[PDB]
Amino acid sequence: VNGGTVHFKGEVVNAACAVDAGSVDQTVQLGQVRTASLAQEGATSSAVGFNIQLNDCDTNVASKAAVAFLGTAIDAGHTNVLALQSSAAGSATNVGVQILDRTGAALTLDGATFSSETTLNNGTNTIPFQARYFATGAATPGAANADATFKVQYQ
Amino acid sequence: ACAVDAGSVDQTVQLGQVRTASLAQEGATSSAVGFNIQLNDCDTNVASKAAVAFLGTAIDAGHTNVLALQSSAAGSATNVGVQILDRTGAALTLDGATFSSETTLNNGTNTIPFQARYFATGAATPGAANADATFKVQYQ
Amino acid sequence: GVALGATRVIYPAGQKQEQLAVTNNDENSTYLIQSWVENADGVKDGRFIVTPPLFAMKGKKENTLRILDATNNQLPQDRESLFWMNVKAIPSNTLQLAIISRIKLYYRPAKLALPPDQAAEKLRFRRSANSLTLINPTPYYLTVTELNAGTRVLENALVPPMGESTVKLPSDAGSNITYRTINDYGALTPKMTGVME
Amino acid sequence: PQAFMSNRARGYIPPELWDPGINAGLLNYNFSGNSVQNRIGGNSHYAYLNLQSGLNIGAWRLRDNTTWSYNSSKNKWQHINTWLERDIIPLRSRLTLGDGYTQGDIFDGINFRGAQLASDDNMLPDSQRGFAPVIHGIARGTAQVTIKQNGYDIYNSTVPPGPFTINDIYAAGNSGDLQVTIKEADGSTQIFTVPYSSVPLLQREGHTRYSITAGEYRSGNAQQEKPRFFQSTLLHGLPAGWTIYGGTQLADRYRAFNFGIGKNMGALGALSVDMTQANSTLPDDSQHDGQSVRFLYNKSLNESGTNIQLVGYRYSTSGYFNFADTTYSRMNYNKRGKLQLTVTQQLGRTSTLYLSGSHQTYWGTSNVDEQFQAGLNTAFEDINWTLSYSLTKNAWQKGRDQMLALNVNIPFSHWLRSDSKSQWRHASASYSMSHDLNGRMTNLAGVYGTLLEDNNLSYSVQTGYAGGNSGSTGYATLNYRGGYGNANIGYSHSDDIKQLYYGVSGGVLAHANGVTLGQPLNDTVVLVKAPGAKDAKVENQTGVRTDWRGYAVLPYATEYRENRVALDTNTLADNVDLDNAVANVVPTRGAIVRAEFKARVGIKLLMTLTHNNKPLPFGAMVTSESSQSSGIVADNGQVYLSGMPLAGKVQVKWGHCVANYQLPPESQQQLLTQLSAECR
């Protein structure tokens, strides 16, 4: 007519954020290079926008994560310009891609991280970035696809 | 009559490790973990049917069918509790008088199965979830 | 995009193989996972070996990285040691993005003078002009967040064990200091006040 | 528009991914034995063996139950239940042939033997379960909707410029105030709130549950007969918070029709009223017609999440009998009214006062069966205490019949430090004191916990004292949950009684790849097959280890859900490396699903390969046909290989090179070996 007690013991573990960059395969499309427009070093191209979503995680762990970009610099002077990674007939000359910030300031590719400042969009936490071409003297009609590395320090 | 089996008086159930991805929003539940309550010497003539009722602290009035995890020195998880299902798969109210589904008492040993589950009321913070419940048995 | 099981992996001394879960939530995504361990200076090191180093993940799948020890008991047994575990997801005219998730690997000696619970409280503050130094006598790495000097946050600090970390403080901030350190599992400890000792 | 789009619910699994299982046998045994030694009657031995056989061939699941009893004086094998079950995916239903029970909620629970086809709710995604309002709306322009609870957000998504219906809202407890907020790109945000109150008889809009049962009636009592009967049950969720539930219970002598409606009034609460009209032929030739009404009310959260009230009234007019009264013997006082009032009040965020009152009056017999229950459970830090009171004044002169109980649970972690390595951390002290309001005291103080590395061996030593008689009843128990079975042994000592309990429970699977032993099974089971990986503990389960052949069985797996099965890489032989340490299986109801793991038994090797004194390029594939192994070069020519012989050769395909290598026995004994081998 009477019984005892049952106790339940378990652990709830925090999970790291899942990073989604732009479209599938972490790919962001860029407009084709304009040979006439990419004349001088200061010449630029269309600043195509994209975003990185830190989904499947809490809005606190996502917000506390530091963020950085890195890659291969094309030249000593062009620290912020990513070297194009292409070994074919489609390699272009004196071209590269720049990863900009929200405002439009250049982002260092050395690895110096900065606060994410994630915007809490209805879905999840998001950080927007932009990419644009940066000529360095000359232009060539070739597909100047590049490769960059995203670093997220989960504090 | 009969009584609860020796050893089933005080029982411990290891739910395991669950992640905020599994419990991120209100109503999300983890994988059920089975556990049984055993009765010995229950004869058909003395008591045909029996059922149990669990008595435990509710995390909030709104969710009276789920438990409240106890605070710990290291740190207790927030907005998550323990929910006790049944053979039919429905939740059990943690009130003393609300009993479970009836069962047929076979002569001798009789095992009644139940499931323990994690129930998240909102976003779940990481930590250790430990909960207690007291169960009483009514024979018919 | 790949995800790690926890944002903080604590490896106790004396074990051989820690485990860390890697998962792929996206159903249609082919990935190449490359994992390694660097010291506290961001230098690739062989003291911890993550196996398999590079492997291919197809679709929605979960694997387990085994962190094998090779310290040979050459690390100090007095205080915790810090390492950085980096997991990179190569997504094998367009620029591709490879994500490097970096987590903290705490090599924790088996026997310590103080339990982890009391480490957070014993964190004193040395206040001076344009400085809010945090002194941590406890032998644990303290992850101080939401460092409020009255009405303003300073930044997120990582105070080493038995060390004094430095933080720049604007003079307009008030005397009152409130903080909260991230615990073992990754949650936020309730907001404590700060003593001036 | 989203409404026209076939948007799937959250956590939806296609029926094709569901695993029927494997064609395999099943045998669950539970042997128990009691040695009772009393000074008056010497010693006696009792034995009870419960054997549950089964066969899962194709999709059909045959199950059979048998009991064997022994006293110390004869053997009597007694069948109990046999049933052949199956799941019909197109009908979203479950079919059962043979013995079974009626899960009827509108009607009373009935045990039978026949055919039952009943819709199953577990097959539905977890999101579309229970009761939750479905949001219908028209969004002008592409908008973003955030249906948010009183506390936090629930459903955030994007909606096209058209009609949209959202039915993925979770149950979210009994009561909820869902604020639907749509935000258009151009127009100002549009918000509206909907409250709801759920009742177990309420169903979601456009949701149907049905149950068709036919066959003989089976009951434990020998007096009751075995008439054939039919039972139809239907539960439909109409739009706008209405639910229509009907039922028909037909037999030779009993014919009943139940009709009822349930309503979700929102802030007011939830209501459910049903009338059952029944014509029954009693055991005597007299025929009785009757109607019974079951009114049920659920009030929403009063104050601010403090009080919840449930009022269940049942009026059974004279001449209303259930099926049992009809099915009584050839020759063998009705309930004029029943009232259940339950009030739960939460206070101090820790104490939960539960008050319950049952009040049943009969026809003729004016005596009322009053039953009052009051529970007060509080959880102050680790301390967990409970004070309960009961008062039962029934018709058959039960008197006052009061009872008081006090239970305190104090874990030892309250005093032990957080990082303590002592086994005492997984221990607690339970103190119970019961009074019968007459001087009868029942004290019981005990320690309990687990004392094994995997926390399998659960121990419990509780002494006691029953005083009117003054008997100090000690009680010791040890349960062990190993990888082969559960073994429990206990010693119950009294003033003149010594009881020794000893039992073993286990499960046996005669699958295609030999016989596998393990813990007692529970409906669905997962057969983890990792040949060559001996004694490898599985994850998130206690005491479930692979046998010497590498086959183990998981006691429980959630049906029609994505569950993870992981092998603990920490407690695994250093000579073995798994290609995949985690698998996912979606089992059907009562299905044996194989989670296959590939394990390499050779030594673990890290090879630095250089071609023409140059490291091999990134992404190069290094295979070895000698032991069937593969790997990918990471950097600097470092490649990982699992399951490799002592002396061998590997092939490298950067875009065809061979690398020979030899290893010493000390290298073979090393955990992970590192060697450098120049390639051709």
Residue numbers in the entry:
A (entry chain A): 5 to 159
B (entry chain B): 20 to 159
C (entry chain C): 1 to 92, 101 to 205
D (entry chain D): 116 to 187, 194 to 453, 478 to 613, 617 to 803, 809 to 833
Reported in the publication:
The assembly conditions were further optimized to produce a sample with an average pilus length suitable for cryo-EM, allowing us to determine the overall structure of the FimDHGFAnC complex to 4.1 Å resolution. However, the rod was initially not well-resolved due to its flexible connection between subunit FimAn-1 occupying the pore and FimAn-2 emerging from the pore. Multi-body refinement in RELION-5.033,34 further enhanced the resolutions, yielding 3.6 Å for the pilus rod (body 1) and 3.9 Å for the assembly platform (body 2). By combining the maps of the two bodies, we constructed a composite map that includes both the assembly platform and pilus rod, which sits at an approximately 51° angle on top of the usher. On the periplasmic side of FimD, the FimAn-FimC complex is bound to the CTDs, while the preceding subunit, FimAn-1, occupies the pore of the usher. The NTD is unoccupied and not well-resolved. Multi-body refinement provided insights into the movement of the pilus rod relative to the assembly platform. Although restrained by the rim of the β-barrel and the extracellular loops of FimD, principal component analysis revealed a twisting motion of up to 11°, as well as side-to-side and back-and-forth motions of up to 19° and 18°, respectively. Multi-body analysis indicates that the connection between FimAn-1 and FimAn-2 serves as the main pivot point for pilus rod motion relative to the usher.
